[PDB]
Ligand binder design. Structure first.
Ligand SMILES: *[C@@H]1O[C@H](CO)[C@@H](O[C@@H]2O[C@H](CO)[C@@H](O[C@@H]3O[C@H](CO[C@H]4O[C@H](CO)[C@@H](O)[C@H](O)[C@@H]4O)[C@@H](O)[C@H](O[C@H]4O[C@H](CO)[C@@H](O)[C@H](O)[C@@H]4O)[C@@H]3O)[C@H](O)[C@H]2NC(C)=O)[C@H](O)[C@H]1NC(C)=O
Ligand SMILES: *[C@@H]1O[C@H](CO)[C@@H](O[C@@H]2O[C@H](CO)[C@@H](O[C@@H]3O[C@H](CO[C@H]4O[C@H](CO)[C@@H](O)[C@H](O)[C@@H]4O)[C@@H](O)[C@H](O)[C@@H]3O)[C@H](O)[C@H]2NC(C)=O)[C@H](O)[C@H]1NC(C)=O
Ligand SMILES: *[C@@H]1O[C@H](CO)[C@@H](O[C@@H]2O[C@H](CO)[C@@H](O[C@@H]3O[C@H](CO[C@H]4O[C@H](CO)[C@@H](O)[C@H](O)[C@@H]4O)[C@@H](O)[C@H](O)[C@@H]3O)[C@H](O)[C@H]2NC(C)=O)[C@H](O)[C@H]1NC(C)=O
Ligand SMILES: *[C@@H]1O[C@H](CO)[C@@H](O)[C@H](O)[C@H]1NC(C)=O
Ligand SMILES: *[C@@H]1O[C@H](CO)[C@@H](O)[C@H](O)[C@H]1NC(C)=O
Ligand SMILES: *[C@@H]1O[C@H](CO)[C@@H](O)[C@H](O)[C@H]1NC(C)=O
Ligand SMILES: *[C@@H]1O[C@H](CO)[C@@H](O)[C@H](O)[C@H]1NC(C)=O
Lengths: 221, 226, 218
C-alpha cells in the first residue's frame, strides 16, 4: 500500500526550469519512473531511478535536459526538466514498481503497480488573468442557455449553476487555448422553455489563480 | 544477510545496464554468450596429469571468469568501493560475506566508506573458511578469487592448472584439493541467487541438486550442470 | 522496441465483449518462460492504472472479466462484459527493457449507442462582449452520437476557415452521447460588417445538414 505523493501544479515560463517531487509513502520501491502525458497525447517514459543505488536512466528525447535524483533520508525523488518549452506542458506522473530489493536475490517483475496522482506543469509566457463571463442567452421545447468564460490564465476555472442546485443537463466544455495564449471556455445547460422567462439562472464561475468570482445572470434576451 | 552490510557502490558509466539484474530475474545479459562459451576448452583437450599435486604460484592473464578452467587470483582484502551487490564465497555451499573493517568487525555503511573492506582471504576447508568467491565490480564485471589452483602435471602446449575437480586428468585433483570457487567440475558450478548475474552464459545449465562431502561435514547444495 | 496497438477507437455495446491487440517489434518472451507485456488503463480524469502484468496475471482489484493472452510478439486484452465503468484509454507496455518502459499509443474504449442527431443551437455575441471590442458567436451540438461531426460557419453565406475553435465533452455517463461547442471569434469591427451568421452541422444522424442562423439586428 505504498503511496506516491507528488508536488503541486507549476506555472512556468519559456526558458526556465521546474523540479517536480515525488515521495514514496509507506514502503520501499525497486525503481521510480517519470512518465508524462501531453494534452491529448499518450504516455511517455522520461526516466527512472533505482532509489537504493541512486543511479538513473534517461530516455533519449530528454537526455541532457532532465536529471532524476533520489533523496534517501526523506524517501523523496526529484525530476528536473530544464529549458522548458510550450511543448512541455503535460501532467507529470511518478510511478513505481517493486517493493525494494529483498537483499537476498532478484525479484520477479510485478508491473508498474502504483502511480502518483500527477503534477500539472504549464509552460507559457502568458500572465494571470481572470475571466470575462458573458451570457449565452436563450433565443414544450427544450431551451439551451449558458455562460462563455473567456480570456483567462492559467487554468483551471470551475463553473456551476444556481450555486450547485442545477447539475442535470449541464455541459462545461474542455477549455481551448487561443492564439493570445489565454484559455476560453463555455458552459451550457438545457432547461424547459416553460421556465425561460420565469426561472432565474445564475452561472457561478471561480478562478482561484486570480481570486475571481463572478455570478452572471442569464436572462432571455 | 543484513542488507546494510552489502557493498553497493555501483557505477553504470558504460551503460551496460547490469544494475537491473540485482532486482529482477529476467534482466541478466546473456548476449554474446554462445560464441564466448565456445572459447572454453572441454577437459578432453588438456594433457594428462601425473605425479604429485603442487599448488600453482602464478596469476595467468585471462580475465574471462566464465570458463570452468579459469585459474583465479588468490583471495585478499578488497575495498568495498570496488564491489556491487553481494559477494558470494563457496564452502562449497554458497555464503555471503558482509562488509567489515580490517579486523572483521561488521560495518553497516553500504560499503560507502574507505574503511569498508571485504576480507575474502581464503584457506581451503575443512580447516579453512571457503574455496573461492565471486562478485560484481563497480562497473559491471564479474570478479572471482580463490585457490591457489593445482599443478596437475602434464607435458606440452596443453597443460591443466586445475581450479576444480579434475579427476579425469589426475586421480587426486578433487574439489577439496583444487576447488577454487563455484565450479565443482568442468560441467557444474554452484547455483546461488546471482549465478545468472555473475555467470550469464550458464543460463541453459540444468539444476541438479547435489550432496557433497568436504572433510567429514556434508554440504547440501544445488549445482547447475550443462 | 516499438509497441503498436489496434484498434485506436473501440465502440462497444454494453455487456458485449471487447478485444484490443498489441504487437511488439521484437519477441517479449524471455529465457525465464514469461511474456513481459503489461496492460494499463487510464480512465478519464485518473492516473494510469495497472490491469495485467506478465501477459496474463491481473492486478489488485481487477475483475475476472479482464483477461490477457498472447505470446512472443502478438498479445490481446479481452474484456468480457463491457460496462460504462470500463471506458478509458488502454495501453500495453513491454517490460523486457526495464528500467526503460515504452508505451503504445493507446486504445480508446467507448460505449456504443444508437445514432443520435445533435440538437443544434446558435448564440449571438452578448451586448457586454460587444462593448468589450470582441465578438464570439457560439454553436452548440448537444447529445449526439457517434462523435464525428462537421461544423460549417458561413458569414454572409461565405465559408470561414481558421477563425473557429471547437471542444467536445468526453462521453456522457448516462446517455453515452457527446456535446460539442464551436466558437467563431471575430472582432467588433468585423462582426458589424456582416449580417447573416450561420452554423451548418453535418452528422450521421441528420438526413440533411442542419443550419441555424441569425441576423445581427434581431
Ligand atoms: C540457450 O538455449 C536457447 C534456446 O535453445 C538458445 O537460443 C536459441 O538458439 C537457436 C539457435 O541459435 C535459435 O533458433 C534459430 O537461431 C538462428 C540463428 O542461427 C541461424 O543463422 C545463422 C547465420 O546465418 C546460421 O549460421 C545458423 O546455422 C542458423 O541457421 C536464427 O537465424 C533463427 O531464425 C529466427 O530469426 C530470424 C531473423 O534473424 C527470423 O527471420 C526467423 O523467422 C526466426 O525468427 C532461429 O531463431 C533460437 O531462436 C534461440 N532462442 C532464443 C530464445 O534465444 C541459446 O543460444 C542457448 N544459449 C547458450 C548460451 O547456449
Ligand atoms: C589478506 O591478504 C591481503 C593481501 O591481498 C593482505 O593485505 C595486505 O597485507 C600487506 C602485508 O601485511 C599490507 O602491507 C602493509 O602495509 C602497511 C601500510 O603501508 C601502506 O603503504 C605502504 C607504502 O610503502 C605500502 O607498501 C603498503 O602496501 C600499504 O599500502 C605497512 O605499514 C606494512 O609495512 C605493510 O607494507 C597491506 O597494506 C595489506 N592490504 C592490501 C590489500 O594491500 C591482508 O593483510 C590479508 N588479511 C588477512 C586477514 O590475512
Ligand atoms: C572492473 O573490472 C574491469 C575489468 O577487469 C576493469 O576494467 C579494466 O581496468 C584496467 C585498469 O584497472 C584496464 O587496464 C588498463 O588498460 C588501459 C587500456 O589498455 C588497453 O588498450 C590499449 C590501447 O588503447 C592496449 O595497448 C592495451 O593492450 C589494452 O587493450 C591501459 O592503458 C592501462 O595501462 C591498463 O592496462 C583494463 O583494460 C580494463 N579492462 C576492461 C575490459 O575494461 C575496471 O577497471 C573494473 N572497475 C573497478 C575496479 O571498479
Ligand atoms: C542502514 O542504513 C540506513 C541509511 O541508508 C540507516 O538509516 C539505517 O539505520 C541503517 N540500518 C542499520 C540497522 O544499521
Ligand atoms: C564511474 O567510473 C568512471 C571511470 O572512468 C568515473 O569517471 C565515474 O566518475 C565513476 N562514477 C562513480 C559514481 O564512481
Ligand atoms: C548486453 O551487453 C551488450 C554489450 O555490453 C549490449 O550491447 C547489449 O545491449 C546488452 N543487452 C541488454 C539487454 O542490455
Ligand atoms: C598449440 O595450440 C594451438 C592452439 O592455439 C594449436 O593450433 C597448435 O597446433 C598447438 N601446437 C601443437 C603442439 O601442435
Amino acid at each position: 500500500q505504498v503511496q506516491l505523493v507528488q508536488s503541486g501544479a507549476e506555472v512556468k515560463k519559456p526558458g526556465s526550469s521546474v523540479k517536480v517531487s515525488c515521495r514514496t509513502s509507506g514502503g520501499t520501491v525497486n525503481t521510480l519512473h517519470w512518465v508524462r502525458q501531453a494534452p491529448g497525447q499518450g504516455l511517455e517514459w522520461m526516466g527512472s531511478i533505482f532509489p537504493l543505488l541512486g543511479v538513473p536512466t534517461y530516455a533519449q528525447k530528454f537526455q541532457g535536459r532532465v536529471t532524476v535524483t533520489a533523496d534517501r533520508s526523506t524517501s523523496t525523488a526529484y525530476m528536473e526538466l530544464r529549458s522548458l518549452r510550450a511543448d512541455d506542458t503535460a501532467v507529470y506522473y511518478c510511478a513505481k514498481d517493486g517493493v525494494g530489493w529483498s537483499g537476498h536475490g532478484p525479484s520477479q517483475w510485478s508491473g508498474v503497480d502504483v502511480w502518483g496522482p500527477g503534477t500539472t506543469v504549464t509552460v507559457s509566457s502568458a500572465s494571470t488573468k481572470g475571466p470575462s463571463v458573458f451570457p449565452l442567452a436563450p433565443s414544450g421545447g427544450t431551451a439551451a442557455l449558458g455562460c462563455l468564460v473567456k480570456d483567462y490564465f492559467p487554468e483551471p476555472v470551475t463553473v456551476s449553476w444556481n450555486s450547485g442546485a442545477l447539475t442535470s443537463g449541464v455541459h462545461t466544455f474542455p477549455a481551448v487555448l487561443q492564439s493570445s495564449g489565454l484559455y476560453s471556455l463555455s458552459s451550457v445547460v438545457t432547461v424547459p422553455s416553460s421556465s425561460l422567462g420565469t426561472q432565474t439562472y445564475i452561472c457561478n464561475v471561480n478562478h482561484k489563480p486570480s481570486n475571481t468570482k463572478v455570478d452572471k445572470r442569464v436572462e432571455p434576451k | 544477510w543484513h542488507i546494510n552490510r552489502t557493498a553497493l557502490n555501483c557505477n553504470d558509466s558504460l551503460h551496460t545496464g547490469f544494475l537491473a539484474a540485482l532486482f529482477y530475474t529476467h534482466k541478466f545479459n546473456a548476449s554474446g554468450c554462445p560464441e564466448r562459451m565456445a572459447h572454453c576448452r572441454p577437459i578432453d583437450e588438456f594433457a594428462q596429469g601425473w605425479g604429485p599435486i603442487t599448488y600453482a604460484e602464478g596469476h595467468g592473464s585471462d580475465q574471462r571468469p566464465y570458463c570452468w578452467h579459469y585459474a583465479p587470483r588468490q583471495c585478499g582484502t578488497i575495498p568495498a568501493s570496488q564491489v556491487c551487490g553481494p559477494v558470494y564465497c563457496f564452502t562449497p555451499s554458497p555464503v555471503v560475506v558482509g562488509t567489515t573493517d580490517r579486523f572483521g568487525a561488521p560495518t553497516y555503511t553500504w560499503g560507502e566508506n574507505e574503511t569498508d573492506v571485504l576480507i575474502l582471504n581464503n584457506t581451503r576447508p575443512p580447516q579453512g573458511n571457503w574455496f573461492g568467491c565471486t562478485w560484481m565490480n563497480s562497473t559491471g564485471f564479474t570478479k572471482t578469487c580463490g585457490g591457489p589452483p593445482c599443478n596437475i602435471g602434464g607435458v606440452g602446449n596443453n597443460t591443466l592448472t586445475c581450479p576444480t575437480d579434475c579427476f579425469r586428468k589426475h586421480p587426486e585433483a578433487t574439489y577439496t584439493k583444487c576447488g577454487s570457487g563455484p565450479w565443482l567440475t568442468p560441467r557444474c558450478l554452484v547455483d546461488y541467487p546471482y549465478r545468472l548475474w555473475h555467470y550469464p552464459c550458464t543460463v541453459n545449465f540444468t539444476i541438479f541438486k547435489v550432496r557433497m562431502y568436504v572433510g567429514g561435514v556434508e554440504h547440501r547444495l544445488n549445482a547447475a550442470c550443462n | 522496441i516499438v509497441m503498436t496497438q489496434s484498434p485506436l477507437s473501440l465502440p462497444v455495446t454494453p455487456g458485449e465483449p471487447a478485444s484490443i491487440s498489441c504487437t511488439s517489434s521484437q519477441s517479449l518472451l524471455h529465457s525465464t518462460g514469461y511474456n513481459y507485456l503489461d496492460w494499463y488503463v487510464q480512465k478519464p480524469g485518473q492516473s494510469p492504472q495497472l490491469l495485467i502484468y506478465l501477459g496474463s496475471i491481473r492486478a489488485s482489484g481487477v475483475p475476472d472479466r479482464f483477461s490477457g493472452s498472447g505470446s512472443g510478439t502478438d498479445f490481446t486484452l479481452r474484456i468480457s462484459r463491457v460496462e460504462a465503468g470500463d471506458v478509458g484509454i488502454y495501453y500495453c507496455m513491454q517490460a523486457l527493457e526495464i528500467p526503460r518502459l515504452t508505451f503504445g499509443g493507446g486504445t480508446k474504449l467507448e460505449i456504443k449507442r444508437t445514432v443520435a442527431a445533435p440538437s443544434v443551437f446558435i448564440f449571438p455575441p452578448s451586448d457586454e462582449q460587444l462593448k468589450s471590442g470582441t465578438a464570439s458567436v457560439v454553436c452548440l451540438l448537444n447529445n449526439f452520437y457517434p462523435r464525428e461531426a462537421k461544423v460549417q460557419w458561413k458569414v454572409d453565406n461565405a465559408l470561414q476557415s481558421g477563425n473557429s475553435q471547437e471542444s467536445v465533452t468526453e462521453q456522457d455517463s448516462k446517455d453515452s452521447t457527446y456535446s460539442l461547442s464551436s466558437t467563431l471569434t471575430l472582432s467588433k469591427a468585423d462582426y458589424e460588417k456582416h449580417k447573416v451568421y450561420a452554423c451548418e452541422v453535418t452528422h450521421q444522424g441528420l438526413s440533411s445538414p442542419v443550419t441555424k442562423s441569425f441576423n445581427r439586428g434581431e
